[PDB]
Amino acid sequence: NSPRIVQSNDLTEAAYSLSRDQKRMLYLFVDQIRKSHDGICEIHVAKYAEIFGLTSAEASKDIRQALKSFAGKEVVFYYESFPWFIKPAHSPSRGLYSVHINPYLIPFFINRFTQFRLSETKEITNPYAMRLYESLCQYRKPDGSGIVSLKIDWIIERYQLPQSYQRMPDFRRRFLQVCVNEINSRTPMRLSYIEKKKGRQTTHIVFSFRDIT
DNA sequence: ACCTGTGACAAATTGCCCTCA
DNA sequence: TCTGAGGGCAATTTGTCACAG
DNA sequence: GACGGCCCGG
DNA sequence: GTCCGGGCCG
Ligand SMILES: [Mg+2]
Ligand SMILES: [Mg+2]
Ligand SMILES: [Mg+2]
Ligand SMILES: [Mg+2]
Ligand SMILES: [Mg+2]
């Protein structure tokens, strides 16, 4: 039914820091780009609102503030860094935004790949819970199940978690427990996990999931 | 020294509301 | 009249650190 | 602000 | 009474 996002594993595993609104827009950019190019995409306020169940006003606010906050953002592929945009965004017409994605990023967008339908992610709120759902999809099987062990240092680096989550009780309480709850409540996935320890330190997290269909 | 969890507070983000070209 | 670009809001979540054990 | 029905006057 | 054309309004 819904638009089918596919992306290079290099992006699933890239290091960057984007908000929920920015990541929502990035899914549509990757969709335009892949159907073809020169990096130039476009966003209509009224279509965004319908896709994500917003009013026109709040869609306008979300697009406007998301687009200004891209300035200065980098993406790092492991170790190579690029800016997302190489020119500011602009409105040719009322309700329309035109954007210039760094053309050197196209090959990184487009066989080791990750794929999910846009409806799977459109209710998630915390952007770190979006990062986690993409990584698990990367290991999904046709029947929708999978199992993967992610190393904690790699999570902190790739998703760029904030500094106080280097204390493990804060990592548990404000990132791990919250994002596993969102996935279980807001997606069709059913997710469980266990901690892997070495001495007194927890080093990896092992995720198992299956599909509710 | 290390490990855990919880209570407090600060800062950020959420869906809402109203105006007006 | 419908759109969307502005200005705001309070209630909640997310980010930080002191303290018990 | 942009777009379409509607009532004016010639 | 009718009609093409503008141009104000919801
Ligand atoms: Mg944030
Ligand atoms: Mg918002
Ligand atoms: Mg939550
Ligand atoms: Mg006591
Ligand atoms: Mg003691």
**Are A185 and A162 a contacting pair, CB within 8 Å?**
no
Domain regions of chain A by residue span: 1-122, 123-213
In angstroms and rounded to an integer, the radius of gyration of the C-alpha atoms of chain A is 18
For A163, the 3-state DSSP assignment is helix
Method for structure elucidation: X-ray
Residue A181, nucleotide of least CA–C1' distance: C13
Assess contact for A4 and A115: CB atoms under 8 A.
yes
Q: Whole-angstrom Cα distance, residue A150 to residue A153?
A: 9
In chain A, beta strands by DSSP E:
4-8, 40-44, 74-77, 80-83, 96-100, 113-117, 146-151, 189-198, 201-211
Please state, as a whole number, how many other Cβ atoms lie within 10 Å of the Cβ of residue A72. 8
Spatial distance from the CA of A38 to the C1' of C12 (Å): 42
Per-residue 3-state assignment (H helix, E strand, C coil) for A36-76 = CCCCEEEEEHHHHHHHCCCCHHHHHHHHHHHHHCCCCCEEE
- What is the longest distance spanned by two Cα atoms in chain A? 61
DSSP A11-31: HHT-B----HHHHHHHHHHHH
| CB of A147 nearer than 7 A to strand B | no
Distance of CA A71 to the CA centre of its chain: 18
In the block, residue with structure tokens 């697009």: A63
Q: How far is the CA of A166 from the C1' of B13 (A)?
A: 23
* Nucleotide nearest the Cα atom of A49 (by C1'): C4
Strand partners, A42: A98
Residue A204 phi, psi dihedral angles, 5° rounding:
-130, 160
Q: Which of A158, A136, A166, A137 shows the shortest CA–CA distance to A149? A: A136
Distance A126 CA to ligand 3 centre (A): 7
- Contacts of residue A9, defined as CB under 8 A and 6 or more positions apart, other chains included, come to A112, A113, A114, A138
End-to-end CA distance of chain A: 15
Our measurement of CA A61 to C1' C11, in angstroms, reads 20
